[PDB]
């Protein structure tokens, strides 16, 4: 008896959190079927209408993975990335995979926004934290990416493109070892169109794909970062399909990654992620999530997925 009404959604959620226990299905039936933008209007309407803070109430009413997914869904796009990078770096351990996932997949523009926001939210620069929590070549790649200075044009410099391919090839022909800085320079600095052309040229002169050379010539998180960049440049949806596969295959589940990817990409390219997932693994993302998770947690996850393939 109306279209999208933030106030009405606010009432549904409040009712769901009232009384003994919590009607999580009511919560899902609303939030999982609203856009990130709409969820922000709901937060505003809830505080206006109820005089309480929606995020605080959700946190006090929910727990575990279900809580993590719902709160993630409720967080504005930029702030979610910022809070995920911070979480990746707090504590003794560092979630380098998360750092790579975010820094290799977001545009230089989105990264610049994440930068300023990181600074305002915590008081330190994203770069400083990266420098403190990572080292050597991997640190350098992240420092470059985090600054968001990658060429944003679509300009193709023929001469430079040919030289880049050569430098990359020669980098894997050095006696002492792989001239890793070359990979960093080319893969972190050039614009997409230029890089994609460089990959073709590389293939021509080396008779091998850049990805296979990266896998045999480099290792560790540095290797992962380069691969992430290449994959995100060529077929970003496939990169996330793989990310999701790795988080669910074999004993257990990397819930942090599973949740972040499903939440962050739900409104961006989930359909294409699903297509690539089935192509790569023969199974549908839906079937994988369904058999690797459970509870209301699984329910919201399957909905973010969108349906079986
Ligand atoms: Ca309750
Ligand atoms: Ca598993």
């Amino acid at each position: 008896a109306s279209g999208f009404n933030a106030a009405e959604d606010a009432q549904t959620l409040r009712k769901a959190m009232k009384g003994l226990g919590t009607d999580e299905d009511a919560i899902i039936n609303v939030l999982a079927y609203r856009s990130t933008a709409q969820r922000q209007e709901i937060r505003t309407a809830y505080k206006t209408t109820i005089g309480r803070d929606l995020m605080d109430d959700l946190k006090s009413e929910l727990s575990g993975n279900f809580e993590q997914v719902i709160l993630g869904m409720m967080t504005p796009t930029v702030l979610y990335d910022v809070q995920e990078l911070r979480k990746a770096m707090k504590g003794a351990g560092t979630d380098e995979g998360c750092l790579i996932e975010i820094l290799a997949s977001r545009t230089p523009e989105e990264i610049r926004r994440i930068n300023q926001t990181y600074q305002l939210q915590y008081g330190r620069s994203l770069e400083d934290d990266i420098r403190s929590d990572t080292s050597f070549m991997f640190q350098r790649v992240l420092v470059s990416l985090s600054a968001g200075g990658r060429d944003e044009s679509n300009y193709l410099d023929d001469a430079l493109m040919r030289q880049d391919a050569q430098d990359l090839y020669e980098a894997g022909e050095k006696k002492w070892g792989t001239d890793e800085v070359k990979f960093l320079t080319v893969l972190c600095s050039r614009n997409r169109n230029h890089l994609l052309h460089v990959f073709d040229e590389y293939k021509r002169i080396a008779q091998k794909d850049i990805e296979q050379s990266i896998k045999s010539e480099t290792s560790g998180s540095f290797e992962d970062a380069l691969l992430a960049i290449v994959k995100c440049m060529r077929n970003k949806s496939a990169y996330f399909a793989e990310r999701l596969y790795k988080s669910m295959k074999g004993l257990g589940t990397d819930d942090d990654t599973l949740i972040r990817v499903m939440v962050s990409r739900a409104e961006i390219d989930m359909l294409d992620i699903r297509a690539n997932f089935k192509r790569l693994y023969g199974k549908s993302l839906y079937s994988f999530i369904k058999g690797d998770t459970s509870g209301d947690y699984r329910k919201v996850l399957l909905i973010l997925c969108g349906g079986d393939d």
Side-chain angles (χ1 to χ4, degrees):
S2 180
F4 164 64
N5 193 77
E8 283 172 52
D9 282 350
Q11 313 313 293
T12 299
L13 280 52
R14 179 58 186 175
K15 193 285 182 58
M17 290 188 286
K18 280 291 296 298
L20 183 59
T22 303
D23 187 333
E24 293 188 358
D25 286 355
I27 297 178
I28 297 175
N29 282 57
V30 173
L31 302 176
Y33 295 86
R34 300 291 182 281
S35 68
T36 298
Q38 296 182 313
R39 294 173 196 138
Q40 301 319 303
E41 298 184 10
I42 293 178
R43 289 173 61 172
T44 297
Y46 184 96
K47 184 162 289 176
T48 295
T49 288
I50 313 300
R52 297 175 61 89
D53 188 289
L54 180 55
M55 300 296 273
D56 291 331
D57 292 351
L58 286 178
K59 296 178 183 182
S60 70
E61 300 290 299
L62 313 174
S63 61
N65 295 322
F66 183 64
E67 163 179 53
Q68 185 174 169
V69 296
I70 294 299
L71 288 179
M73 291 167 56
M74 293 303 301
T75 307
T77 310
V78 182
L79 183 56
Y80 187 49
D81 283 350
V82 168
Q83 303 189 314
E84 278 295 305
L85 290 167
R86 183 68 192 77
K87 177 172 70 175
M89 293 182 279
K90 220 302 164 292
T94 294
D95 189 333
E96 306 194 321
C98 172
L99 300 184
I100 290 171
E101 176 190 306
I102 291 179
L103 292 175
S105 67
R106 271 54 166 180
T107 65
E109 145 64 55
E110 302 178 316
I111 292 172
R112 289 199 294 281
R113 291 187 180 182
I114 289 170
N115 283 303
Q116 74 179 185
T117 298
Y118 193 81
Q119 177 64 58
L120 276 299
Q121 292 290 165
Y122 308 112
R124 301 184 302 290
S125 66
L126 172 59
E127 188 181 316
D128 279 356
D129 277 15
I130 287 175
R131 294 176 168 298
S132 302
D133 298 1
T134 63
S135 65
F136 207 33
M137 290 312 295
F138 177 53
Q139 183 202 90
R140 285 216 215 171
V141 172
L142 295 189
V143 169
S144 173
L145 293 178
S146 71
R150 179 194 293 288
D151 181 5
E152 309 177 78
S153 73
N154 300 304
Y155 183 61
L156 193 181
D157 186 312
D158 185 292
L160 179 59
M161 185 276 290
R162 286 182 166 59
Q163 193 55 57
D164 286 337
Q166 265 297 162
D167 293 314
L168 272 49
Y169 173 61
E170 287 177 52
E173 297 293 303
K174 307 305 297 179
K175 300 179 181 179
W176 52 283
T178 306
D179 191 358
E180 307 194 314
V181 64
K182 299 298 179 180
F183 279 102
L184 177 50
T185 303
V186 179
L187 280 54
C188 295
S189 313
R190 313 293 188 257
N191 68 64
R192 184 174 186 283
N193 185 40
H194 178 99
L195 265 186
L196 291 181
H197 279 268
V198 168
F199 297 152
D200 292 336
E201 179 67 2
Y202 181 81
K203 171 66 62 57
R204 190 179 71 65
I205 68 180
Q207 298 203 308
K208 292 185 180 181
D209 188 70
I210 184 65
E211 283 185 53
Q212 33 191 175
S213 291
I214 292 171
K215 292 179 183 178
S216 67
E217 293 172 33
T218 67
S219 58
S221 292
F222 175 63
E223 187 202 345
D224 297 334
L226 276 43
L227 248 39
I229 293 173
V230 174
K231 287 174 178 170
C232 284
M233 285 288 170
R234 290 176 160 169
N235 185 358
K236 198 193 302 279
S237 292
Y239 169 70
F240 284 112
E242 185 178 64
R243 190 67 172 151
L244 292 165
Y245 176 74
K246 266 69 178 305
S247 69
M248 295 180 280
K249 193 63 177 64
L251 303 176
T253 305
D254 177 349
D255 296 297
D256 286 326
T257 294
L258 171 57
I259 293 170
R260 182 182 53 259
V261 174
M262 291 315 288
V263 172
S264 71
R265 311 301 291 186
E267 291 175 44
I268 301 177
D269 58 338
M270 192 51 62
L271 288 301
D272 202 43
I273 288 178
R274 288 162 54 183
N276 283 277
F277 190 104
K278 193 178 188 305
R279 173 179 65 78
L280 297 167
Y281 312 112
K283 298 299 176 183
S284 69
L285 173 58
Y286 191 106
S287 68
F288 249 85
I289 293 178
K290 180 179 182 177
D292 205 61
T293 65
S294 59
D296 291 310
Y297 171 49
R298 176 171 61 177
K299 250 55 206 64
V300 58
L301 245 48
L302 290 181
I303 295 175
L304 291 178
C305 184
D308 192 59
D309 290 297

